[PDB]
Design an enzyme around this catalytic site. Structure first.
Site, PDB file in Angstrom:
ATOM      1  N   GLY A  13       0.824  -1.204  -0.053  1.00 49.56           N
ATOM      2  CA  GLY A  13      -0.130   0.035   0.035  1.00 49.56           C
ATOM      3  C   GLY A  13       0.841   1.358   0.106  1.00 49.56           C
ATOM      4  O   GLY A  13       1.861   1.306  -0.546  1.00 49.56           O
ATOM      5  N   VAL A  17       6.980   4.420  -1.403  1.00 49.59           N
ATOM      6  CA  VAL A  17       7.191   4.896  -0.034  1.00 49.59           C
ATOM      7  C   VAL A  17       7.986   3.703   0.633  1.00 49.59           C
ATOM      8  O   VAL A  17       8.223   2.900   0.174  1.00 49.59           O
ATOM      9  CB  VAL A  17       5.861   4.903   0.845  1.00 49.59           C
ATOM     10  CG1 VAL A  17       6.346   5.365   2.169  1.00 49.59           C
ATOM     11  CG2 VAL A  17       4.820   5.934   0.176  1.00 49.59           C
ATOM     12  N   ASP A 124      -9.152  17.914   1.506  1.00 48.08           N
ATOM     13  CA  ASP A 124      -9.247  16.585   0.896  1.00 48.08           C
ATOM     14  C   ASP A 124      -9.236  15.566   1.926  1.00 48.08           C
ATOM     15  O   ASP A 124      -8.727  14.604   1.922  1.00 48.08           O
ATOM     16  CB  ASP A 124      -8.158  16.029  -0.043  1.00 48.08           C
ATOM     17  CG  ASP A 124      -8.382  15.012  -0.892  1.00 48.08           C
ATOM     18  OD1 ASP A 124      -9.611  14.653  -1.217  1.00 48.08           O
ATOM     19  OD2 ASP A 124      -7.530  14.233  -1.372  1.00 48.08           O
TER      20      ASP A 124
HETATM   21  C1  LIG Z   1       5.621  11.022   4.273  1.00 44.63           C
HETATM   22  N1  LIG Z   1       4.568  11.687   3.817  1.00 44.63           N
HETATM   23  C2  LIG Z   1       4.275  12.753   4.391  1.00 44.63           C
HETATM   24  O1  LIG Z   1       4.795  13.433   5.306  1.00 44.63           O
HETATM   25  C3  LIG Z   1       2.717  13.330   4.001  1.00 44.63           C
HETATM   26  N2  LIG Z   1       2.156  14.584   4.685  1.00 44.63           N
HETATM   27  C4  LIG Z   1       2.945  15.671   4.887  1.00 44.63           C
HETATM   28  C5  LIG Z   1       3.081  16.313   6.225  1.00 44.63           C
HETATM   29  C6  LIG Z   1       1.741  16.422   6.724  1.00 44.63           C
HETATM   30  C7  LIG Z   1       0.901  15.338   6.371  1.00 44.63           C
HETATM   31  N3  LIG Z   1      -0.280  15.577   7.273  1.00 44.63           N
HETATM   32  N4  LIG Z   1      -0.175  16.526   8.135  1.00 44.63           N
HETATM   33  C8  LIG Z   1      -1.235  16.838   8.857  1.00 44.63           C
HETATM   34  C9  LIG Z   1      -2.128  17.900   8.105  1.00 44.63           C
HETATM   35  C10 LIG Z   1      -1.733  19.085   8.119  1.00 44.63           C
HETATM   36  C11 LIG Z   1      -2.526  20.181   7.482  1.00 44.63           C
HETATM   37  C12 LIG Z   1      -3.550  19.848   6.723  1.00 44.63           C
HETATM   38  C13 LIG Z   1      -3.875  18.350   6.585  1.00 44.63           C
HETATM   39  C14 LIG Z   1      -3.236  17.611   7.510  1.00 44.63           C
HETATM   40  C15 LIG Z   1       0.936  16.972   7.736  1.00 44.63           C
HETATM   41 CL1  LIG Z   1       1.589  18.501   8.992  1.00 44.63          CL
HETATM   42  C16 LIG Z   1       1.058  14.357   5.550  1.00 44.63           C
HETATM   43  O2  LIG Z   1       0.280  13.578   5.268  1.00 44.63           O
HETATM   44  C17 LIG Z   1       2.659  13.802   2.490  1.00 44.63           C
HETATM   45  O3  LIG Z   1       3.462  13.103   1.630  1.00 44.63           O
HETATM   46  C18 LIG Z   1       3.485  11.661   1.837  1.00 44.63           C
HETATM   47  C19 LIG Z   1       2.489  11.116   0.915  1.00 44.63           C
HETATM   48  C20 LIG Z   1       2.136   9.778   0.902  1.00 44.63           C
HETATM   49  C21 LIG Z   1       1.321   9.187  -0.276  1.00 44.63           C
HETATM   50  N5  LIG Z   1       0.819   8.400  -1.095  1.00 44.63           N
HETATM   51  C22 LIG Z   1       2.587   8.968   1.979  1.00 44.63           C
HETATM   52  C23 LIG Z   1       3.389   9.814   2.840  1.00 44.63           C
HETATM   53  C24 LIG Z   1       3.775  10.989   2.698  1.00 44.63           C
END
Ligand SMILES: CN1C(=O)[C@@H](N2CCc3c(nn(Cc4ccccc4)c3Cl)C2=O)COc2cc(C#N)ccc21
EC number: 2.7.11.1
Length: 267
Positions: A13, A17, A124
């Site tokens: 999944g 990554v 989203d």
């Molecule tokens: C490793 N990884 C991430 O870090 C990821 N990511 C960035 C940091 C982050 C994240 N959610 N928040 C909280 C939040 C802040 C504001 C609004 C909403 C939520 C914050 Cl802050 C988050 O989901 C982005 O890219 C990815 C994509 C995929 C796939 N496919 C897998 C892993 C990652």
């Protein structure tokens, strides 16, 4: 410099990554967002935005732990959550009991309320962006970078979703500004998915037919929820997927109903 990591800091999944373990902190998930030539002038913007979202500390919100900015590689680092997203959990062989499902929702409400306090509009929200740890606690994620202007453009570069949770005012009207009530709509459809244990609309193709059906007031089939679902939760999802955004409540408003409710009825 505080959110700057690099590959040599790491030992080495979902998607493209990889798991990782930094020296000081425990276990981490790493994803590479962009592979290609150096944009360079669009780096100060990436880091300034990375530190702006590093500020988001809540136990039910995913924390950005760092960002790897090397020659060609651009990557993001976040907290580890072993059970995956909420849907994969809901679709599991063993059923998730009512009391757990109730807590999950309360946790989602808290995390969304924190984000709205800080001024962040998710844009989203869906079960794919609800991550679950080993003890069935949850964190709100953003795996498609919808709230991160600069990093999403970096993902969609020249050189390098599912509309079931989108409010009908955004369907076929792309120029309308997402408000706090946009997430409230998405939250409603998450509530459905939780007790239905599946994605809505029979996971059917995202047609113009379905879009116009939803804009005209169609919603996920409540009859499809075959397991027991509290009336307070059925009332809340119907309230939160109202066509008129003013009719939808606020997440602070939701929490005031639901926290007292969860503690007595469900826990
Ligand atoms: C490793 N990884 C991430 O870090 C990821 N990511 C960035 C940091 C982050 C994240 N959610 N928040 C909280 C939040 C802040 C504001 C609004 C909403 C939520 C914050 Cl802050 C988050 O989901 C982005 O890219 C990815 C994509 C995929 C796939 N496919 C897998 C892993 C990652």
């Amino acid at each position: 410099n505080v959110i700057k990591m690099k590959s040599s800091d790491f030992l080495e999944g979902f998607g493209k990554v990889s798991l990782a373990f930094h020296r000081t902190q425990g276990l981490m998930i790493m994803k590479t967002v962009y592979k290609g030539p150096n944009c360079i002038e669009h780096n100060e913007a990436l880091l300034e935005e990375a530190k702006m979202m590093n500020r988001l500390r809540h136990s039910r919100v995913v924390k950005l732990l760092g960002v790897i900015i090397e020659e060609g590689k651009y990557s993001l680092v976040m907290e580890y959550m072993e059970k995956g997203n909420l849907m994969h959990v809901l679709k599991a062989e063993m059923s998730t009991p009512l009391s757990v499902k109730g807590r999950i929702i309360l946790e989602i409400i808290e995390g969304m309320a924190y984000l709205h306090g800080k001024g962040v509009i998710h844009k989203d929200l869906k079960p794919e962006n609800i991550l679950v740890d080993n003890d069935f606690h949850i964190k709100i994620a953003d795996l498609g970078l919808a709230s991160f202007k600069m990093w999403s453009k970096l993902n969609n570069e020249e050189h390098n979703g599912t509309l079931y949770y989108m409010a009908p005012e955004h369907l076929n009207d792309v120029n309308a500004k997402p408000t706090e009530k946009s997430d409230v709509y998405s939250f409603a459809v998450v509530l459905w998915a939780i007790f239905a244990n599946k994605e809505p609309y029979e996971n059917a193709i995202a047609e113009q037919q379905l879009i116009m059906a939803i804009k005209s007031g169609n919603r996920p089939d409540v009859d499809d929820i075959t397991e027991y679902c509290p009336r307070e939760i059925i009332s809340l999802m119907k309230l939160c997927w109202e066509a008129n955004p003013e009719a939808r409540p606020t997440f602070p408003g939701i929490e005031e109903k639901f926290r007292p409710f969860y503690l007595s009825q469900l826990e």
